[PDB]
Design a protein around this ligand. Sequence first.
Ligand SMILES: Cc1cc2nc3c(=O)[nH]c(=O)nc-3n(C[C@H](O)[C@H](O)[C@H](O)COP(=O)(O)O)c2cc1C
Ligand SMILES: Cc1cc2nc3c(=O)[nH]c(=O)nc-3n(C[C@H](O)[C@H](O)[C@H](O)COP(=O)(O)O)c2cc1C
Lengths: 174, 174
Amino acid sequence: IKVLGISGSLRSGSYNSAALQEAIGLVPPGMSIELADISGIPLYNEDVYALGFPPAVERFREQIRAADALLFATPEYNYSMAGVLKNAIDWASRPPEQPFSGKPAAILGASAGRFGTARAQYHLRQTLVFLDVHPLNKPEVMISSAQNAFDAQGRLLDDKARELIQQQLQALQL
Amino acid sequence: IKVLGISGSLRSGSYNSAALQEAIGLVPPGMSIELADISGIPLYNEDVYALGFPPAVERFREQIRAADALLFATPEYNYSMAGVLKNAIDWASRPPEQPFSGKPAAILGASAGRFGTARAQYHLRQTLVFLDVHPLNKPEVMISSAQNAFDAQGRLLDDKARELIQQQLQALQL
Ligand SMILES: Cc1cc2nc3c(=O)[nH]c(=O)nc-3n(C[C@H](O)[C@H](O)[C@H](O)COP(=O)(O)O)c2cc1C
Ligand SMILES: Cc1cc2nc3c(=O)[nH]c(=O)nc-3n(C[C@H](O)[C@H](O)[C@H](O)COP(=O)(O)O)c2cc1C
C-alpha cells in the first residue's frame, strides 16, 4: 500500500513535515510512506497552465495517480489551510483526469498555538471531497503546541500523538 | 478615500481582475481604486520570511496599510478561495504589525458556470475577520457565468452585477 505524504509547509523545520516524517516509522506491516515535494510548484496561473503543466506539477500529479492513498499534513494559516498547500492542490486538480479522483486519504494537522488545524482540516476535507477524494472520518489527529511536541531533530514526544497516528494509519489501511 | 483592489487571479483575462477594473469606472466622487499587484509575491516559506519580506510582499503590505478600504475579488477553486490569493494574504499577515488590522473591506467573486465563490467568499470573510478586518455583510456580490458576463477585453455586459458593484462601492464609502 503506497501512501503519499503531503506537507503544506515548505520550511525545513516544519512541524507538519516532521509529523509525516514520524508517520513513516509508524506505518503497519504492508504499508509504506513516501513524502511528496511541492517546493517546485509555482503559483497557479491559467495562462501558464494553458501552455502545459510545469515539470514540478507533472511529477506531483503522477505521484498522486500512482499512490494508493494520500496523507495530508496541513498547517492552519489564518483560520484556513495554508495557501501553499491549497495552491498545490489547485494545480494538480486541472483536467484532464485529475489524479485525486477516487483516492482515499487521511488528514492530520500541526499548529503551534493552542488551537489551529481544526478549520484548515475541515476546509481541506471539503476541498478534497469536492475532487472526489474519500477521506477517513476518524480518528482525528491534531498536533497542538507543536513547538513543545517535538525536539531539535524533529521527533514526536507525545505517546498519545504517536499512538494516534498509528491508529490512523491502520484505520487508513482498512 | 483610497481603496485597494486585490484580485485572486493572475491570468491576463481574469474576470475578477476585469470586475475590479470596472469598479474603477464606477467610483463615486471622493473615492479612488488602485489595483494591488501580487504576481510578484512568492510561495510562502517561513525560512524566507525569517530573513525579511520579499520586495513584492513589502510593496503589498504598505499599500494595504495606506489604503482606507479593501476590495477583494476572489475566484473560487475547488470549494474554497484561490490558493494564490490565500498565499498573498498569508505573506501580508505576518508580524510586525500586519496592515489588515482595522481596515474595512468588501467581497465579490467572479466565476464561470453553475455556482461560484460562495464558499471562497465565506472562507475569505472568515480569514479576514481573523485578521481584524471589518468586512461588509451586504450586499453579496457574485458574478456567475462570468465567461458570458464579460466580453473581449473587459466591459461587464451584465447590468445586474453593475448595480451591486455600485451599491457595494456606496456602502463602502459609508
Ligand atoms: C501566515 C501564517 C498564518 C498562521 N495562522 C494561524 C492560525 O490561524 N492559527 C494557529 O493556531 N496558528 C497559526 N499560524 C502558526 C502556525 O500554525 C505555526 O507557526 C506552525 O508551527 C507552522 O508549522 P509548519 O511549519 O509545520 O507548517 C500561522 C503562521 C503563519 C506563518
Ligand atoms: C482549480 C480550479 C477549479 C475550478 N472549478 C470550477 C468549478 O467547479 N465549476 C465551474 O463552473 N468553473 C470552475 N473553474 C473555472 C473558473 O471559475 C473560471 O476559469 C474563471 O473564469 C476564472 O476567473 P478568474 O480568472 O477571474 O479567476 C475552476 C478553475 C480552477 C483554476
